Design a protein around this ligand. Structure first.
Ligand SMILES: Cc1cc2nc3c(=O)[nH]c(=O)nc-3n(C[C@H](O)[C@H](O)[C@H](O)COP(=O)(O)OP(=O)(O)OC[C@H]3O[C@@H](n4cnc5c(N)ncnc54)[C@H](O)[C@@H]3O)c2cc1C
Ligand SMILES: Cc1cc2nc3c(=O)[nH]c(=O)nc-3n(C[C@H](O)[C@H](O)[C@H](O)COP(=O)(O)OP(=O)(O)OC[C@H]3O[C@@H](n4cnc5c(N)ncnc54)[C@H](O)[C@@H]3O)c2cc1C
Ligand SMILES: Cc1cc2nc3c(=O)[nH]c(=O)nc-3n(C[C@H](O)[C@H](O)[C@H](O)COP(=O)(O)OP(=O)(O)OC[C@H]3O[C@@H](n4cnc5c(N)ncnc54)[C@H](O)[C@@H]3O)c2cc1C
Ligand SMILES: Cc1cc2nc3c(=O)[nH]c(=O)nc-3n(C[C@H](O)[C@H](O)[C@H](O)COP(=O)(O)OP(=O)(O)OC[C@H]3O[C@@H](n4cnc5c(N)ncnc54)[C@H](O)[C@@H]3O)c2cc1C
Lengths: 385, 387, 383, 385
């Protein structure tokens, strides 16, 4: 538990209602969502009604019309409840709706954003492939113009929400020879002829999200399915990832926060040598380092969100947030498990789950390594400035 | 026994034993590791094959059915075995260090014949019941009691977290024979399983080492023969602590195996995965991770072999065992954490074994004394060294 | 706000202090460290600019700024010179801070105002040879006798001891009341019964003086007491809460200048065909230094703004100080590392940044004490 | 104290002999050697008479006839006394005598090893150059063949013992076109015509050692000055560094040991909050971490040493030893400072010196980065084997 730096009442109330939602709707289902690898359909629907799946989306498109600070706060609060619910919400907000928001036509937004703001339909984000994730520009899924259609061939890998999404923002090369000047974004309906979902990934964590390959074999979509112009798909993917990284940062904050909550509450009631673990100096330090890691990571997350909100550049900041929050989430969740001792290793405590859930935040939407590359490039640019 | 160079070039019996165990782990444990994890399946047949190989009773004299090996051999074997499967390794480690260990060290000849020998071949394994629900870190505070009743002890209380609980035919159980004497009032008991008065709690559903069973031993007025006490009354604290010292060598080696296989996985994967036109191992940060993993791992192994070797040479090894277990456990998590990282998306899914090694490594920082406990044990003996 | 648009005053102040640091501190920082030279001239100029009395109101001769401004100035000043930084930090937070918040009108007139312009600076005497972290164990005593407090005991490690003209001194008016028995005293320097110990030969911030305050039958007037008797511990702790924001910002400056040095050097140092910044591990190092520095800065700013907004900030002050101090060591360690051999010698400022960073993990409450402070407030907020 | 499986009685006695020498002869002067940047000439000569400057050197040639395990033990005990004395000694053993023993002719050994075994003359090692300290195969310093002589041109950088050495092993390109394979190693007398010493470096630590550039301007040396064959210089430099890294690892052990010594003794005797520091769990934890890191690095160091003694490969292991021990020295010396509190920041205690001395061990004889590159390289080539 931290000190809201100076939050406006709108985001204060947003935090509370999300926290209330997460504690009422997500905390009791988080264990089943993870153990039964069960997509939290009912809750995602209720979240859509609340505008949580479309926070940055203008209301006239059916969204909540909030900002990315709001999103960061909601994302942390939801992911505190359920990390899977969190990334599901994050994919829809950041990775699916975001690029259609930033790059669609009016027609595209009306048809692909608005039907995906209420929880009845969620989207997904298909950039990674089996051969390339970090090397996103190596996308070898092809899109070929033919007739009134784009013809998509290839396999997209690791698509969060693959098994629940009704639409996908897919990145395919419209020319591989052009490299990352040859990627394009396509709005793809799901399901649609030519599109086979791969087997669900058996995941370490965020087990309530589906992750699967999108398999395009001669998958034909209208020519106006392209998002933006041919070739700007990479920049679309990158800028979407900049915003998304704020969401994953906030997801990581959630996991971190709930792991710290679990560690504290357990340490206050677990007894050692006649007194709570929180009397042990060693436990105190762990808690202190967890709090510091977490609040540090949140300030970075808020910074990136606030920068994006204020139309300031935020790539470095989003990456730092995503990096710090993710490594905090693992570190905190690792230490939550440790503070719980034996109980940290077992399923009748949520700590092992946070640890598993935390792990993913270091990986997708750009691994920690990629985040550091992103940070270093922008740090260096700012110095040559 | 043991020269200092033996730390650097294994005696060839140990080199042979390494190859034998690697071969066994690769052929017998590697193919089933995922299954053992996914299905929380006790590897009964592999434990039996290991028993036939002596791996379940390494330090046990051949006179009693053991391999007649040493702790260096055990550390090496625990590494290779746990490299194949962390669960198998722990099962093996509990039987060697935690069950057989105290009996070889503190038991009478008769107790070794009855309690060690039938547990040397993989047909029966033991377990070690020291922790209790309210206390897993203090080996000096058992609320489970052992009251003397004529030709028997009567055990009452719940031991917590017993690895092999659902497969062990016997338990070294620590109970308080004299609550008032606190840490001077604990005794060690050889307990048959099953036995009247002993109920097993439900299997714990774990993060890893999923092939191992973990459950409480609920003793409700459970009678055991009088001569089931290990050592004398009151010696339970020392027995538990001295068993934990040997066990930590086993856990450290277990962590070495988890770390080594995670590193193996990372290296093989980084060598065969491309990004930005080259193999991951061309990336400097990947090279640095692998280097850090190898360094962490080889350090922890040197610490582990040192602990084993000191035990082999009849030397004190509390601090060195705790250092081994601490170093290897933390290396096992870090190395396995980084193996996941090197695999990227693959490190998060069951296509690859990396997330299993992560989950598996996690336990090594907990059991047989948490890292915090290991640091307390290290500090306390470091300071004793200066005094 | 933080990065997200700093208020115009603060941005201006940042440029002002960056202008000052680069123009007046950067050229002398190496000499200040090497010759353990108190930067009197620079401190006087800083006094003119209001940097020695930033939170102090204009009426008392202060800059009328806030702690966000303070922290910013502290970072920019300490970027230039770490010793200059702590000298300014002691005066602002540790000396002027408690007098502003706890002194009478008369004490503020007599002890704040003459210390707002750089002509006189103060210091802060809490730690003792026997105890620093255990601040409440102050065994220096103050005994009421007549119109006078009688001070006996050694205060240890007093920054600005050899240049300050007043000390906020913490002596126990009754050791049996423990940290309820401590009082805070305005002690002029020099004064009879007060002897300065010899200057500590320090690892870094070598331009600050650090020396013991030896009180032997040292009589000050009865109204030298800051607040009421027994308030000294809370005065010390609340002063340190503010001070930790200053040291956090000193750490930010050392870290930032270590990072500046590292980036600039790696940009121009060639290895295997190109600049060190093309090497991936160098990029990661720099990325981690930047992330450590920025997050710690945010924490620092959080704390500062909290204090400015009259909100609780003990945990946040401690977090800022801990994170910035460890970042400053980590960053300055890696700045050295990035410079290679140049990191180890005086041709480069890196080795000094390393030496200066190290102190930020110690004084105004060790990282360990800070972590306890964080733990206590974290736990209290869950209860 | 730490434990080991055994030391051979030779190495046990040597440990005591060195520990006795360090506490008696080095401990009293270590603060002054550092503070006055004072070359411990007398202690070095006394060590010369003990064999410490020529430990792996055949007795035939005036050396101790010991091995690198003994050397590692002695380096640690010496560096535990004085980090400057340690490096002066390490340079002579590993960097100067080492390559001559390994690659010199019997005559070169007689001329260049034997007069440097007893402390009257010490050597140095001139590999780095101002523009290149991490690339042992890119010497800009040239050695042109001129009949029965070699002519050296260029500046070697950062030469430890530069102002005290009577000889240098100097690496200079004898065929710049051959890059990697066009380095050669040379025995250069000091002083010698054409060799000018640069101004002494003013260093964070090991301030009792001298560090200066070796400026060679048409420096002529006999033909027989070349160590091994032309083009062998990169191999000689690399295998010399392998040996030297064991020495530096050992120096870092001693610095780490004396730092932990200092911290343990201090924490056992400093009270805070009514009890000694060592009753504080975090001090205990620090001490534990320092002890582990120390003894772990020592095992790594002795492994590299014994591998060398047993004429086994040890590039990875020497790099690991040096890497772990140098980072241990810095972390342990950092933590020693912390444990001392204010005392750790001032010359009243030696902690701050250990901190400063430790810092060099992460830099010379291959930075931590290069060590990790070396580790990575050989780990991979082990895997590809
Ligand atoms: C649960 C889950 C959900 C996912 N969901 C989605 C999704 O919804 N949409 C989507 O598009 N993708 C998704 N992904 C893919 C994800 O973003 C990738 O896993 C990630 O980008 C890394 O890619 P990779 O697996 O291909 O690893 P690789 O790219 O192969 O990375 C391997 C390793 O090398 C490192 N590496 C790679 N390149 C470099 C470099 N230049 N320098 C240094 N190190 C480098 C990485 O950091 C990593 O450690 C998901 C993945 C997971 C696990
Ligand atoms: C998978 C598994 C298998 C197990 N198998 C066995 C088995 O076969 N036999 C057996 O006897 N036990 C077993 N255990 C029990 C195990 O050893 C304990 O979980 C462990 O020692 C930690 O104790 P605890 O769980 O009771 O936690 P606690 O003791 O409550 O520990 C909680 C936290 O407090 C810290 N802590 C505790 N004491 C102190 C202290 N003095 N100072 C500072 N910190 C402290 C710990 O480090 C930890 O972070 C097993 C546990 C698990 C999870
Ligand atoms: C350069 C310098 C300038 C200084 N300037 C000033 C000044 O102007 N005014 C002033 O009042 N003081 C000043 N000090 C004192 C400084 O604040 C103290 O050094 C510090 O607050 C406490 O350290 P100590 O030296 O008493 O060491 P100790 O308090 O003995 O600390 C020893 C160790 O115990 C550790 N520790 C771990 N856990 C705990 C715990 N639970 N409780 C206590 N210690 C714990 C500490 O972190 C430290 O590592 C200065 C010190 C230095 C070095
Ligand atoms: C006190 C002292 C004494 C010395 N004594 C000697 C001596 O007796 N003999 C001698 O020959 N030299 C000596 N040196 C030189 C020393 O070995 C070098 O400083 C060291 O090897 C680093 O080289 P550099 O200074 O050129 O730094 P650089 O090589 O410029 O390194 C700068 C940074 O880049 C990193 N880096 C460099 N190459 C790579 C790469 N390929 N991949 C990733 N990161 C990389 C380094 O790790 C470092 O962080 C001494 C140096 C010092 C400071």
């Amino acid at each position: 538990i931290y000190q809201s730096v100076e939050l406006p009442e709108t985001h204060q109330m947003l935090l509370q209602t999300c926290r209330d939602f997460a504690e009422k709707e997500l905390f009791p289902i988080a264990a089943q969502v993870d153990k039964e690898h069960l997509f939290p359909a009912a809750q995602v629907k209720k979240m859509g009604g609340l505008g949580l799946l479309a926070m940055d989306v203008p209301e006239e498109l059916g969204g909540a019309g909030l900002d990315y600070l709001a999103y960061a706060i909601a994302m942390e609060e939801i992911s505190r409840g359920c990390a899977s619910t969190g990334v599901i919400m994050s994919v829809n907000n950041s990775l699916y709706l975001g690029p259609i928001l930033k790059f669609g036509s009016k027609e595209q937004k009306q048809a692909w954003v608005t039907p995906f703001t209420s929880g009845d339909k969620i989207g997904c984000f298909a950039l990674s492939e089996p051969g390339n994730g970090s090397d996103a520009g190596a996308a070898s899924t092809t899109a070929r113009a033919e007739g009134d259609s784009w013809v998509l061939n290839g396999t997209k890998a690791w698509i969060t929400n693959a098994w629940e999404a009704s639409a996908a923002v897919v990145f395919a090369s419209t020319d591989r020879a052009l490299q990352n000047k040859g990627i394009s974004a396509f709005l793809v309906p799901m399901p649609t002829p030519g599109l086979t979902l791969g087997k669900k990934e058996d995941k370490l964590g965020i087990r309530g999200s589906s992750t699967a390959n999108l398999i395009f074999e001669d998958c034909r979509i209208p020519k106006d399915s392209i998002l933006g112009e041919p070739g700007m798909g990479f920049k679309i993917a990158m800028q979407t990832l900049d915003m998304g990284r704020i969401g994953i940062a906030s997801q990581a904050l959630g996991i971190a926060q709930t792991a710290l909550d679990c560690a504290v509450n357990y340490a206050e009631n677990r007894m050692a040598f006649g007194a709570p673990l929180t009397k042990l100096q060693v436990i105190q330090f762990k808690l202190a380092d967890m709090a510091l890691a977490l609040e540090s990571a949140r300030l970075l997350t808020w910074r990136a969100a606030m920068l994006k909100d204020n139309k300031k550049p935020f790539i470095k900041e989003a990456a730092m947030a995503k990096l710090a929050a993710s490594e905090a989430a693992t570190a905190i969740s690792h230490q939550a498990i440790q503070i719980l001792g034996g109980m940290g290793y077992v399923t009748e405590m949520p700590a092992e789950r946070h640890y598993r859930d935390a792990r993913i935040t270091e990986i997708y939407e750009g691994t920690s390594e990629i985040q550091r590359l992103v940070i270093a490039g922008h740090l260096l640019r700012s110095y040559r400035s």
